[PDB]
Amino acid sequence: DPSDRLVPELDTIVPLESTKAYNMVDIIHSVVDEREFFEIMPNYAKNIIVGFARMNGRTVGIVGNQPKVASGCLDINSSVKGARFVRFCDAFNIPLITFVDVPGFLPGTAQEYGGIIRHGAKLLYAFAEATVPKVTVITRKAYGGAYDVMSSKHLCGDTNYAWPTAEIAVMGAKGAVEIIFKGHENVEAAQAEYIEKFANPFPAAVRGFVDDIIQPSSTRARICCDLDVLASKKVQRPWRKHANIPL
């Protein structure tokens, strides 16, 4: 399987409308070598996907959001699953590849009573402490603190890419305009301006938060090359017996 194989089938896999959902497993199968993917916990916490695959013959760990289940929102079980998988991959020098399409965390009283904060911190810690090479691709959405939890550039990420349909923002347009334009009573133009100049990856690109805006059909060829140069990554951290994960 050539490392520069194009994947034109991913050019239109993301629907134009944000309400319609797609299967992230299709993208994962298209990107990896020979379309072979070993999924871990495929029937538990289905809003997130973790597994092992190969890129140019090298073992890689894959973490991704599943928009089909619960619109891709993060919850307690998915957070724990992804956190432990990421910790295992980091502990044994396995590179991590992340596909990000998340609108935030699942709301509700049950999640708050169950300690969603602790498990979200678990996942954020797992992505933050990883010293193995990590490559992140944003497909459609990355909203709020979840965008930080999903291996952003600012967590010592190595390479971050955004598809032309990516949307990196603090929150949705309606909440942002209702919290900013409290009494402007001019929502008709506020919606247009906000969706024109924020509902796109440009604010993240101009600040350098994403390395490039790439065509989906070149995703695989973009990742493999990165894995060629990040194989010798070495970082230094302060000494400690062990840290205190929020378990």
Binding site: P8, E9, D11, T12, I13
Partner: protein, 673 residues
């Protein structure tokens, strides 16, 4: 392709799919700017990307996007297009659309409105053909009044009688009646069907031809009184009265019969004053007697196959005629050059009524454009999806050669080397038809699929040698994967000791049968011992390419590994048919005898949806019993309606499905007891 000649500089293609792509290609070769129309769903189609400009003309349904005349009109006015090509289907044979087009200033690539109106109904066409001195199917002119009318008409015109709808199309609204009771019940049934679907309630009574051959004659005319016949075409392999396999020359016709049919078609075209490209279809019995059956006033779907043997670009000729130029060819300039065969690759499952529409997204798509004598007409690219709103056609594959044998061999090779992953297709049926002994000999008819597969299509039946070759290839692939799994990079800390194994002893389960295989590897050559037979398999063993070419005892075979599991399950497309095998080691096979068989409960007690689509009619209530052949429900999808039977008799415990729903594939409908 002379660019000096002046033609319209803006043509709008009022169609979609492969025909739009073909028209755009021809216009681009002629230096003509194109304009494309599309719906919201077809926003990333091939034709919208390969054509200059694009206009969204409505939502997904055809009745609001491609049959919506108004949107087409504002698109034409905004784009200032000088010409419009309708292709086939949709509004191509709509007289009122042609009238509205010709109203303001727009020229129409196609026949005059009068010609379409003449060849719009199946009654007036018969009288006009009779007035044009063209052989016609015997029958009674005029609309049959009632049941007693039909039963007294049926007496004189043979024992078999054919009941047809005046406004019928797409192989619909037609029935065969043998006895008087059959005639009188079919009259009412077809009247109701025409009222429900066609909304015309006019019926035609005619003679039924036994074992007929459907022969088309392609005619080209201009606005100066010149008409030419571009040889014939054989279109006999049909299911649901829809063609799948076509041939440009006819192995059944000689020079004299071909000349007579062409002359009759030209006479009919002159009588109707045809001034575009069209086709005249005939039914021919065993005694080489041909009878006129319908005229198509548009471009035929199977036109490209007759382009290979004539060397003409039909779309270019249509455009030139629409401009006003006369024909630049004479009847003596038309000649047969070789042989050409065309197959329609559809997105349907051939194991269910010779094709059942299926939805999905195309993960992999590869055409065999590099194979000799291969042409592909497709509006499909990787990543395309198949919806329930349009025709399920994926591609048209055409192969030409010096004779029929070469064309058929190239067709088989192209079908073997053609990759579709994401949807179910009919390539198995297409490849099985072209290698059939009856088809190879040339003794075929319209009822070919119905008597070659009386119990439905089942796939390629392997012979002993073919089964041995398939088993050897599967075992060699399994051993190749196992050997590849042992190739790690050097560690220099814990060196890898490769397992030095000489013979791989395997148990291969195929269909319901177990075979003992002994495989050995010497470089790229595998020696395979299958049940007392020795075979040699040679290949490069590229485990990532979708197509794998192997040499078994000198015979070259192209196989596709569709899926593979660590448990031993493998799906291999071989000779066009997908076979599911299970490969285990001898120790694993011996230990598998202790495994308990898990409980599976189908027992034909649950009936799910045979295809996805929209439910139209339901006739089953919970608690009510059913019997064999009892109609359960009707689903409409991709231009066709299917109503399923019940199967074994029993009591319907519950009915999960409801009328007007959107039921997908593998969704429970009836839990009959």
């Amino acid at each position: 392709y002379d660019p000096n000649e002046k033609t319209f500089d803006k043509i709008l293609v009022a169609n979609r799919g492969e025909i739009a792509c073909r028209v755009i290609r021809t216009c681009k070769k002629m230096g003509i700017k194109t304009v494309a129309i599309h719906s919201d769903v077809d926003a990333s189609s091939v034709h919208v990307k390969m054509a200059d400009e694009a206009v969204c003309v409505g939502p997904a349904p055809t009745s609001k996007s491609y049959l919506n005349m108004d949107a087409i009109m504002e698109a034409i006015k905004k784009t200032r297009a000088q010409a419009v090509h309708p292709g086939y289907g949709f509004l191509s044979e709509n007289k009122e659309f042609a009238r509205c087009l010709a109203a303001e200033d727009v020229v129409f690539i196609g026949p005059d409105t009068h010609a379409i109106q003449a060849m719009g109904d199946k009654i007036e066409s018969k009288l006009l053909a009779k007035k044009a001195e063209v052989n016609t199917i015997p029958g009674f002119d005029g609309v049959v009044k009632d049941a007693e009318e039909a039963v007294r008409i049926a007496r004189e015109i043979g024992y078999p009688v054919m009941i047809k709808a005046s406004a019928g199309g797409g192989g619909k609204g037609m029935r065969i009646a043998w006895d008087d009771e059959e005639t009188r019940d079919g009259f009412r049934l077809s009247s109701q069907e025409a009222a429900s679907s066609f909304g015309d309630d006019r019926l035609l009574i005619e003679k039924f031809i036994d074992n007929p051959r459907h022969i088309e004659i392609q005619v080209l005319g201009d606005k100066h009184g010149n008409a030419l016949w571009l040889n014939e075409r054989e279109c006999s392999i049909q299911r649901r009265n829809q063609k799948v396999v076509e041939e440009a020359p006819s192995i059944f016709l000689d020079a004299e019969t071909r000349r007579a049919m062409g002359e009759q078609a030209v006479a009919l075209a002159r009588a109707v004053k045809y001034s575009s490209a069209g086709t005249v279809e005939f039914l021919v019995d065993s005694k080489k007697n041909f009878y006129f059956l319908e005229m198509n006033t548009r471009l035929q779907v199977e036109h490209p196959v007759t382009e290979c043997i004539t060397g003409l670009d039909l779309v270019q000729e249509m455009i030139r005629v629409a401009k006003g130029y006369p024909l630049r060819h004479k009847q003596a300039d038309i000649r047969i050059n070789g042989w050409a065969v065309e197959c329609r690759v559809y997105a349907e499952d051939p194991y269910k009524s010779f094709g059942l529409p299926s939805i999905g997204r195309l993960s992999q798509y590869q055409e065999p454009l590099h194979l000799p004598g291969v042409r592909v007409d497709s509006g499909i690219q990787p990543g395309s999806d198949i919806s329930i709103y349009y025709d399920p056609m994926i591609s048209k594959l055409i192969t030409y050669g010096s004779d029929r044998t070469e064309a058929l061999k190239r067709m088989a090779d192209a079908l073997d080397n053609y990759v579709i992953r994401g949807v179910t297709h009919n390539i198995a049926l297409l490849r099985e038809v072209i290698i059939n002994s009856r088809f190879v000999k040339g003794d075929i008819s319209t009822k070919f699929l119905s008597d070659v597969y009386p119990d439905g299509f089942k796939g390629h039946m392997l012979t002993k040698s073919e089964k041995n070759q398939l088993l050897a290839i599967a075992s060699s692939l399994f051993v190749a994967f196992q050997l590849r799994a042992q190739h790690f990079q050097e560690n220099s800390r814990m060196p890898v000791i490769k397992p030095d194994i000489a013979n791989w002893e395997l148990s291969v389960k195929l269909h319901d049968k177990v075979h003992t295989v002994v495989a050995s590897n010497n470089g790229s050559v595998f020696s395979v011992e299958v049940d007392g037979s020795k075979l040699n398999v040679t290949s490069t063993w590229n485990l990532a390419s979708p197509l794998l070419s192997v040499s078994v005892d000198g015979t070259q075979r192209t196989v596709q590994c569709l899926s593979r599991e660590a448990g031993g399950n493998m799906s291999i497309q071989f000779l066009g048919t997908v076979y599911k095998v299970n490969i285990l080691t001898r120790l694993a096979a011996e230990l598998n005898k202790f495994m308990l068989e898990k409980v599976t409960e189908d027992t034909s007690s649950v009936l799910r949806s045979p295809m996805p689509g929209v439910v139209v009619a339901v006739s089953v209530k919970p608690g009510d019993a059913v019997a064999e052949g009892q109609e359960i429900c009707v689903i409409e999808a991709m231009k066709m309606q299917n109503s399923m039977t019940a199967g074994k008799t029993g009591t319907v415990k519950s009915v999960h499905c409801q009328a007007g729903d959107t039921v997908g594939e593998g969704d429970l409908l009836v839990e009959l007891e």
